[PDB]
Structure 1
């Protein structure tokens, strides 16, 4: 393989041959690709329309180069709650709040996360503002998971070889196929997840990648644009179970949720978003709580799918998420997580 061969195939609007996307990603990850070649590749794949085979190859290479967690430290039923970002709506950190609630409900959570790219505060920024240690290595993330019930894998910490691609992504600004990779590259390789996708046209491709590795995942795109399950309107869900993908539309009104306005989910800086987390975990009722409970429930549904029915699953997920907040378990879990980090 060579860059002219691969780039020419893509600019001819052709799918790549098996192995070519992987070759390309490996050149990028080993520091062997010129910034121009990285940019050409990211753009050309995006404009061709990436296939699940192609995106799976890219994610596979990233996972090969990533720092793994220690053997036998990640429960077989661990779940992720993470999105692509890039929805261009400055919301509170819904996945991060959902993940705390899910862990408090007793589902092991290994969250893949990062600082902001286009927003004012990313999940990692907000966790740091809450006093949680974001920058732990493999051994300590495994300890966090075992001791607290949740671990946070900071993407730059676990994927140092991605630094060459990350730099090009910033210079060009435009979203590309690379924006799909964060949720597909959790170094703990959890088999379940609630996965947000800001890009309606690419959510099915993400779902195809998860289907190929036989994950139990709900890939979600709010019909208002959010890379979360929204409360302002319906959401599209690509449901991944038993190696296949089912496209569904989801309406929170079927579970008694009132419609919110997008303004009601608005975020601010890390300090403001930390305050918002504290408010929800402390039992504040209102729009943000509703969105957190909904997303926590979706992750619990994904976790359930590792084994059945859609409606009892949602009912159970919503019951469990709501109780995790109401009993104070979620608030207490955050306190315990903070304490864990301060004790080395």
Structure 2
């Protein structure tokens, strides 16, 4: 109510106040949660607010011990139904470095990455100890957010009932309890680039890219991508598809997680639609760059492309098998 009055008055919360707010929401009646989420969304976000809420959400999560990991994500998925490039990007990145992909419920309350990974044969809820074995054996695991954030249990039905976007759509990608050192975070509108970048700074990420490509929460293979790079301060620049060494190409629509899975798998084995391949590769390139395995985006695409083939399909089947053990 005090924090609610401050928000309703248009005042931005401090990092500490936002950390407190998560713990208040955690134990609040639905009426108060609804009020906080609608008011907060009407006001808008600062980086300090996103980071405080996200840090409190990590601290309340099921604990993970996965070492130094990378993640790639979007606050949506969002917009059109295109293939799930953050999932494909995370799988390609595991050829190079440890990945713990956080999943990351959509506005429908379902995780698009969780549906795609299930279609690729994963059991998507794994224990913390299964997750550690997955990373140690394959460099990859999937952390399904509803399973790792029991504190959100009273919040989920409120988010469902309100139907509007809320702060939880933005902090989802910031709330990975593995504490990723490296992150790609796509955002669904350009006004979120600066607060999300500042929040990653507040959270101590070693290197991150916050991207907004052709109006979507991903790197575009077709038009310009706005980028904020975090790690030496915050740097702003714009990428074009030519910076990755591809010709511009428009992504093609997708109707179901099953189709999304099949098209991603075909790319991973070195085949697939050229439009899917180049869309996946520019996003994989950004993940390799953010995790320091590539020095620039042209090299990141070149290295990601060389990893596709039979070995990548073999990695995928052992990830699937290990997740069901």
TM norm. shorter chain > 0.5:
yes
> Which is worse superposed, 37-46 or 147-156?
37-46
Distance 2:304 2:283 in 1: 9
What's the counterpart of residue 292 of structure 1?
A: 280
Give yes or no for the alignment of 1:60 onto 2:55: yes
Q: 1:41 aligns with which of 3, 27, 36?
A: 36
What's the counterpart of residue 199 of structure 1?
A: 189
Give yes or no for the alignment of 1:246 onto 2:239: no
What's the counterpart of residue 85 of structure 1?
A: 76
What's the counterpart of residue 265 of structure 2?
A: 278
What's the counterpart of residue 151 of structure 2?
A: 161
- 5+ unaligned residues in a row in structure 1: which ranges? none
Asked if structure 2 preserves the Cα contact closer than 8 Å seen for 1:135 and 1:154, the reply is: yes
What's the counterpart of residue 220 of structure 2?
A: 230
TM-score by length of 1: 0.88
Give yes or no for the alignment of 1:15 onto 2:12: yes
Q: 2:67 aligns with which of 57, 75, 95?
A: 75
What's the counterpart of residue 6 of structure 1?
A: 3
Give yes or no for the alignment of 1:140 onto 2:130: yes
Give yes or no for the alignment of 1:112 onto 2:102: yes
Distance 2:109 2:146 in 1: 18
Q: 1:259 aligns with which of 243, 248, 252?
A: 248
What's the counterpart of residue 203 of structure 2?
A: 213
Q: Deviations over 1:161-196 (max 9, x none)?
A: 112222211111111222111100111111101111
Q: What is the RMSD of the two structures over their aligned residues, measured on CA atoms?
A: 1.9
* Secondary structure of residue in 2 paired with 1:249: strand
Distance 1:27 1:154 in 2: 24
List 4+ stretches of structure 1 deviating above 6 A: none
Give yes or no for the alignment of 1:313 onto 2:278: no
Q: 1:268 aligns with which of 255, 277, 281?
A: 255
Aligned residues: 323
